[PDB]
Design a protein around this ligand. Structure first.
Ligand code: U9Z
Ligand code: U9Z
Lengths: 193, 193
């Protein structure tokens, strides 16, 4: 039952490494999960809905790791604090590149996918802003831009830059340089007066 | 002749303010430009090709203004130097939001649109890097990240952040705050040690 479901998801994540959702059929997903097409439809309304669930899992996995970090602060300087935080996104989305890629593309055509991304981006920006405000209240960061506006731009940077790297777009930062690239820009923009 | 062409382009830019290219037909573009559908096809192979030309004009307009700035440096501090530069993109794309929006969406489905964006992004990053290197050679900016990697991330930030603002995405920086937001992050990341 729930195994049929995980099989469908695993099959879909697999096929998305080789081709776009447009080039994967419900028959393709049924076949791969070892069920019939009507049986597939019992579990999921559409292949689109399969993507949404995979994206939902990746996004929630990043979110939960971030919550875990927030509750268990690493004992380091402020540079490594931010690095650790950004790394949650680097590793989580980096471990799920096909889903990341197909999820980002589906924003154009799926109101549910766009709202899912938007909901979590808003949550992550609000967390980023709270940390910057904490740092300013401590007197560690100067009061420059509105914290929420700064957080917005830094989070949008991370989205576009990480996803460009992961897809090997031209242009992009090499994947092996992207973490340090983002941490430098976070730290200088957050602490620079 | 060439007036028929400009009419087709003007009609298309107009209709893109109200709806996506998917919801505009060749008949829609012919009608609006005051020609028949076969006459349209003499000027353009497809509505897709109409978008590509509009994008090509916007992109080249930004590029030419940037070249003009590069040849005629404003007499100011380094903050305003960068502000002026970013402003070329803010104003040029900001003046053509429907084309910006539909052009960005067509990257997913048009190899020509994707290569056009990629070509100019590469050119603008290379220019950004040359300026950062100039500043480092002058001893005004410290030698931190590789200049080209830093430029890549800053340019990808600007793309995602400006386009989010212009489309009124959730989340986004308000359009009236986006310029100062980007300049602060450019200046701190470029000059901060
Ligand atoms: C999928 C996209 C791309 C990756 N994103 C991030 O990297 N944002 C982010 C948010 C918070 C922190 C913090 F505060 F923990 F350091 C670090 C990074 C945004 C979502
Ligand atoms: C359409 C997208 C979004 C906007 N973009 C920029 O803002 N990039 C940019 C490049 C160079 C300079 C400089 F060096 F002149 F300051 C300032 C800004 C990238 C292209």
């Amino acid at each position: 039952g729930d195994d049929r479901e995980l099989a469908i998801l695993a099959t879909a994540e697999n096929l998305l490494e080789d081709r776009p959702l447009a080039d994967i059929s419900v028959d393709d997903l049924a076949k791969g999960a070892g069920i019939s097409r009507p049986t597939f439809y019992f579990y999921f309304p559409s292949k689109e809905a399969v993507l949404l669930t995979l994206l939902d899992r990746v996004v929630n996995q990043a979110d939960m790791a971030l919550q875990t970090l927030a509750e268990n602060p690493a004992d380091t300087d402020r540079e490594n604090m931010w690095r650790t935080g950004i790394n949650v996104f680097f590793e989580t989305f980096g471990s799920h590149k096909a889903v990341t890629r197909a999820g980002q593309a589906a924003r154009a055509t799926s109101v549910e996918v766009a709202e899912l991304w938007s909901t979590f981006m808003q949550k992550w920006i609000a967390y980023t802003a709270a940390v910057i405000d904490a740092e300013r209240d401590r007197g560690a960061a100067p009061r420059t831009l509105p914290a929420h506006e700064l957080a917005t731009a830094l989070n949008l940077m991370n989205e576009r830059t990480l996803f460009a790297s992961f897809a090997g777009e031209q242009p992009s930062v090499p994947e092996a340089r992207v973490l340090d690239t983002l941490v430098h820009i976070w730290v200088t923009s957050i602490y620079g007066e």
